[PDB]
Design a binder for this molecule. Structure first.
Ligand SMILES: NC(=O)C1=CN([C@@H]2O[C@H](COP(=O)(O)OP(=O)(O)OC[C@H]3O[C@@H](n4cnc5c(N)ncnc54)[C@H](OP(=O)(O)O)[C@@H]3O)[C@@H](O)[C@H]2O)C=CC1
Ligand SMILES: NC(=O)C1=CN([C@@H]2O[C@H](COP(=O)(O)OP(=O)(O)OC[C@H]3O[C@@H](n4cnc5c(N)ncnc54)[C@H](OP(=O)(O)O)[C@@H]3O)[C@@H](O)[C@H]2O)C=CC1
Ligand SMILES: COc1cc(C[C@H](CO)[C@@H](CO)Cc2ccc(O)c(OC)c2)ccc1O
Ligand SMILES: COc1cc(C[C@H](CO)[C@@H](CO)Cc2ccc(O)c(OC)c2)ccc1O
Lengths: 285, 284
């Protein structure tokens, strides 16, 4: 009843935000969603937002250009999660100023969910959070399945190729492919977890640590068709986004440091039966 | 098992199309959704399409610029429903339907004002009828999301807080319909022998309301009256504003009777269509 953590989700109509909204409701949190003036005959945003009320969330109107309305919104919750487009990341600095003036917020989870930026606008938001003394949790370390697994890490499409695939290097660099729904559930589980206050939580579910070639081979075993592979060397991979890609697939930046059980999502929350990539890929068959 | 009508939905990731996909699934039709290539780069579209598979729909890949893929798609079904916007894109669909020869009925992208009073939809209708393709035209409603939830105010989709523009005297009857009900009516009519080669008017009786009636439904829900500013026809100097003028000044959705044999809520009385007082509650 009154036991619930009250969470405000900022960016709740986004790809990752909507998942976090639902994950927070499904965890049992009293879930609030920031409603931005953005009606501009955006029928998708509107109906998504109001679909949340049917599930029991509440909407809080505020505007990022109206400092006191952000202050007013965060004063109604205990915890703030932001999941902005990732100019949107730096918009969170206004959010930090409001949390700081509000004084009531117990934890802020900024818009991370990807490459650890501590190896740039995400770092600027971390520094602001830590400067203001706002307790935080940084959720990092995953490749979104929809942008990297469903297309077999090909670019410019979101579904499996039918005949041919580009392999980056030899495709033996380890990558972390995670269904975005699992990222959202780990986020909902960790945001009031005392174990993860002021920590980085790595989302590295063990069985989803895979090379690209391992991901491709999962697909070939599902379809029973060998794809024609073309290996692309680091140098042929001669704008920033291709740079993100190079750090993941050529430098192994998601897997090159081990992580402890006290800081890895699937060990912290072993009850989350995360989606393996053979299961994830079946929907495309 | 296999006594189900097979239906292909074109435009399945759009506002109406997605509703029609689900309504066909809910009606028990073996449901197919056209999967177009430019879908591949849009994660909203992709998650939508593939979520249909989890509900039991199949996807058919085809492209409008590839006649043979259209032909191959329509040979897998018995009925085709299109819900676009690109209205003229349906011409390619018609030639495909024509060549395949197996389609028992085509429902083109209508779901608004009957164009045959009022253009690109008429061109499509001419092509449908010139090819001898049996048809059903679903018309006659204002989408509740675009006209009811905003109390028919413009530039917003949610109820206003204080002011509201009343058009004329707000005494002209308009037809406000939950898009879900339009879709279910479509799903129910598409294989119904009474509606072959007919126009079906979606005009549920309790939802024939003047704008002022709609506003008063909201005031009874909030307990607050709003500031009303009336706008004369002439101040009503966008071709969406023309649509609006026809609806709220000329009353073009309601200036003509429709018979029970051609009105969806009489044809399909088990559809408990959403009344506007229920529809607006979500905004309280
Ligand atoms: N492979 C991976 O690991 C992936 C990780 N990410 C990361 O996840 C996080 C969320 O990314 P993503 O889901 O793609 O973001 P989205 O593009 O889906 O946007 C989500 C929300 O951001 C808000 N937003 C966007 N632009 C603005 C703006 N100018 N002003 C105010 N609000 C804005 C909106 O809030 P509202 O809903 O209220 O309208 C929107 O709903 C990011 O940190 C991103 O880097 C993203 C890609 C894949
Ligand atoms: N007040 C009212 O009653 C309203 C009436 N309508 C009517 O409803 C019907 C459907 O409209 P609506 O659901 O709002 O449409 P949308 O704007 O939601 O678009 C629907 C789908 O049409 C496809 N599409 C759009 N452009 C193209 C194109 N150039 N080529 C190929 N496909 C395209 C796409 O299908 P895909 O998923 O396959 O990519 C798109 O997702 C129309 O006849 C319209 O006049 C619409 C608005 C309100
Ligand atoms: C994994 O870690 C991160 C991942 C991201 C998302 C990246 C970059 O934006 C995605 C696009 O969103 C790349 C991509 C993938 C497939 C595609 O077909 C594609 O076409 C252009 C682009 C951001 C930050 C991260 O830390
Ligand atoms: C009922 O008759 C029809 C109705 C439509 C929908 C029309 C567009 O054409 C809607 C937008 O899609 C107009 C609109 C609505 C609300 C708004 O806040 C708005 O911003 C100003 C503009 C289509 C075809 C029809 O036959």
């Amino acid at each position: 009843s009154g036991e619930k953590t009250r969470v405000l989700v900022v960016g709740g109509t986004g790809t990752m935000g909507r998942r976090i909204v639902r994950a927070c409701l499904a965890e049992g949190h009293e879930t609030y969603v920031l409603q931005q003036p953005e009606t501009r005959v955006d029928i998708e945003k509107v109906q998504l937002l109001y679909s949340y009320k049917r599930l029991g969330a509440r909407l809080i109107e505020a505007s990022f250009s109206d400092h006191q309305s952000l202050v007013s919104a965060v004063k109604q919750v205990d915890i703030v999660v932001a999941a902005m487009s990732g100019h949107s990341i730096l918009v969170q600095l206004k959010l930090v100023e409001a949390i700081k003036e509000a004084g009531n917020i117990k934890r802020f989870l900024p818009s991370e969910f990807g490459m650890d930026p501590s190896r740039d606008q995400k770092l600027e938001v971390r520094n602001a959070i830590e400067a203001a003394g706002i307790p935080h949790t940084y959720v990092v370390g995953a490749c979104f399945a929809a942008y990297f697994a469903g297309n077999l890490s090909q670019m410019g499409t979101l579904i499996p190729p039918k005949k041919k695939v580009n392999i980056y290097g030899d495709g033996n660099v380890k990558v972390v492919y995670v269904d975005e729904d699992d990222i959202a559930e780990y986020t909902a589980k960790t945001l009031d977890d005392p174990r993860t206050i002021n920590k980085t939580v790595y989302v590295r579910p063990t069985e989803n640590v895979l090379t690209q070639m391992e991901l491709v081979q999962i697909w070939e075993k599902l379809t029973g068709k060998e794809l024609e592979k073309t290996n692309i060397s680091a140098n042929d991979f001669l704008q920033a986004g291709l740079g993100h890609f190079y750090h993941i697939f050529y430098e192994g930046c998601l897997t090159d440091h081990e992580v402890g059980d006290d800081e890895e999502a699937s060990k912290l929350y072993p009850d989350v039966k995360y989606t393996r990539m053979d299961e994830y890929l079946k929907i495309f068959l």
